[PDB]
């Protein structure tokens, strides 16, 4: 009831012999589950929480230098010595200047000089880490039944929200009037948070790769430094200039926030302002529809007239939604909603709001359905005052088949081998495909780690040409396939 208006909506149809389905919930998407004699349900991964993160490293973006001091040694006499050179909060450099009689030395040549200035971090950015045990995904399950009575219900929200954690593998949600739904979620495999850091800069946070973050060329402190002054690679944030071999000065390099933003061009912005909330990534769950039953299946069809209070609106997925008010008596009753052909011989459209019912006369009901391509007629109610609303879909079965193939391909590109677990019932074909995809994805990630989309496209074009120019038709086909997949992935990558 909340995923009609979402562009990234997927319909998981059917269950297994055990009455379970495997669905992968992405943050920006929703899943509508439909099974025979089962209520339609909407599932949305609405939150990921990283709890009690531990600071791993601290990086300096804006620094300042103070207390600059210098010491000089006459040529051939060794190296100059500064007392501040023994303090690690002072950054130092040794260089050689021209020395002679004019500036007070006995002989002519290069004399050693050392410049030390105190290094202070004005602004820093922390990279934090969360253990997989401390993730708390939130999922909203809504019975996909059209009841716009938010005020009418005691709770106020028709959707029921369950918090998934690694501690318990089974989560049970009781949808009042529908039985209960069981979710076997896998927070462990959603995102590897052992290999990731939660990098928060000034008032903005990102989700970055751990090795990338530990290879950042900035002054850093360890996560437990606790004095805040012993920065490690301070030389990355200062410049030592000895332009004419006459004098040496040290200046600081300017705020590096803004260059950090350029560095973060492939990251996902997360939010740490009021808690470490992540709105990216997926969660693979197993949906057990064993104690899930329709609602009001013991009611009798309404013997009254329905008034349309909101005209049939097509959703972005080809399903039509319409709101109908009930005017007749016998308030609690089933809504005789059917999708027919012109002659009303065949019922050729399926209802997505299975078993629509009017709980109260005064309150309207939202009904969604998936009409067929072409002309179809929505008949609502019994014949005295019967509503017969026509509709045209404007698609083709071949067209939506191509669209579904593209949706599945994009899911494979985004989710990887996890795409084989979306709306999947345990089968030989799915398991074999997932194993093959695991092997291929491991090899591909090894071969294409760290390269950008333009590099991916160049490599794919090169591989395609190499394969097309090979005398063996087997190796040629293999290389062309690899190159075409690389080109697709490079085009689909980023964001």
């Amino acid at each position: 009831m909340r995923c009609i208006g979402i562009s990234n909506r997927d319909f998981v149809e059917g269950v297994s012999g055990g009455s379970w389905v495997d669905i992968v919930l992405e943050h920006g998407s929703c899943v509508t589950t439909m099974a025979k004699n089962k209520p339609t349900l909407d599932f949305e991964l609405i939150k990921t929480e990283a709890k009690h993160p531990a600071t791993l490293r601290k990086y300096c973006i804006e620094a300042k230098l103070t207390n600059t001091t210098t010491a000089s040694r006459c040529p051939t006499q060794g190296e100059p010595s500064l007392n501040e050179e023994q303090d690690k909060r002072f950054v130092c450099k040794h260089s050689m200047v021209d020395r002679g009689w004019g500036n007070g030395c006995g002989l002519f040549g290069k004399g050693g000089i050392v410049t030390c200035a105190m290094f202070t971090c004005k602004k820093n950015m922390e990279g934090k880490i969360v253990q997989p045990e401390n993730l708390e995904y939130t999922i909203v399950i809504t019975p996909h039944s059209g009841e716009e009575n938010a005020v009418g219900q005691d709770t106020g929200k028709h959707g029921k929200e369950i918090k998934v954690t690694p501690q318990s593998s089974i989560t049970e949600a009781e949808l009042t009037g529908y039985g209960t739904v069981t979710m076997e979620c896998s927070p462990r495999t959603g995102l590897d948070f052992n290999e990731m850091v939660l990098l928060q800069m000034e008032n903005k946070a990102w989700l970055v790769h751990r090795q990338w973050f530990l290879d950042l060329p900035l002054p850093w402190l360890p996560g437990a430094d606790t004095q805040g002054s012993n920065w490690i690679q301070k030389e990355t944030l200062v410049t030592f200039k000895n332009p004419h071999a006459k004098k040496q000065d040290v200046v600081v390099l300017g705020s590096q926030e803004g260059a950090m933003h350029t560095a973060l061009t492939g990251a996902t912005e997360i939010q740490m302002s009021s808690g470490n909330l992540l709105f990216t990534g997926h969660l693979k769950c197993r949906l057990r529809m064993d104690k899930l039953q329709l609602k009001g299946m013991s009611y009798s069809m309404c013997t009254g007239k329905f008034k349309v209070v909101k005209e049939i609106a097509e959703t972005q997925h080809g399903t039509i939604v319409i709101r109908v008010q009930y005017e007749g008596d016998g308030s609690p009753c089933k809504i005789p909603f059917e999708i027919m052909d012109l002659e009303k011989r065949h019922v050729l459209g399926r209802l997505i709001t299975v078993n629509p019912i009017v709980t109260e006369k005064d309150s309207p009901v939202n009904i969604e359905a998936e009409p067929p391509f072409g002309d179809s007629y929505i008949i609502i109610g019994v014949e005295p005052g019967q509503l017969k609303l026509s509709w045209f879909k404007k698609g083709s079965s071949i067209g939506q088949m191509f669209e579904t193939t593209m949706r599945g391909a994009k899911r494979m590109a985004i989710l990887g081998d996890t795409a084989w677990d979306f709306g999947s019932l345990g089968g030989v074909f799915t398991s074999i495909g997932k194993a093959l995809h695991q092997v291929f994805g491991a090899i591909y990630g090894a071969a294409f780690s760290g390269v950008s989309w333009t590099m991916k496209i160049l490599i794919g074009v090169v591989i395609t040409w190499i394969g097309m120019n090979s005398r063996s038709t087997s190796l040629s086909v293999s290389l062309v396939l690899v190159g075409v997949v690389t080109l697709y992935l490079g085009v689909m990558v980023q964001a």
Partner: antibody
Amino acid sequence: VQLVESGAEVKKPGASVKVSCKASGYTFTSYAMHWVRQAPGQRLEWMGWINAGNGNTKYSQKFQDRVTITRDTSASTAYMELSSLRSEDTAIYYCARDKVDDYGDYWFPTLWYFDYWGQGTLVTV
Amino acid sequence: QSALTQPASVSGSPGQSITISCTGTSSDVGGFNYVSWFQQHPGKAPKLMLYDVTSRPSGVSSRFSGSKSGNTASLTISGLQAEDEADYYCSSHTSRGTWVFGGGTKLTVL
């Protein structure tokens, strides 16, 4: 396992008071002997530990230059010596134990540290 | 590596459940499981009630439970009998190899 200390001592400010804890009922050499003070009406305060196995020590920074901890393996007694006493040192001094590792090194504690204490020693000034 | 923070006083009617909080830092309480709770009756040496965050000694009642979340470790008493009225001190083995004791809290029970 019982830890017994010396009797309460009264010292004029600027003096040095040495307290002792006698470890019975267990191998003295296999345990590290901690010293914890508590000002009357204040919280507990860790001072340091003596590794009776080999005499190694570690003092709290607040007592590094004043507190001295020594052991007598044969006597199975630990000693707490706090020189240059001041008004603020009036407090009951406790002794708590902690087993050292299989090799007597004692750098990681045991999760059940300070399991057995002494009745404490009162020092006033 | 400074003194842990605890409420000065805590009270709870007999039979209620009472919770004490010990807040440390990334090295005192949020870094290591060396969180031990000590019960000290007036004029007596402290008694180790809990250790390893949750574990309790052999002779310690089962009404004492410990939890640790982030930099804060909590001690909860369920039965809250009159014999539970005492000063409760929290400790932790810091990352520098030293011991830090919380300020301590007092249970009034009645």
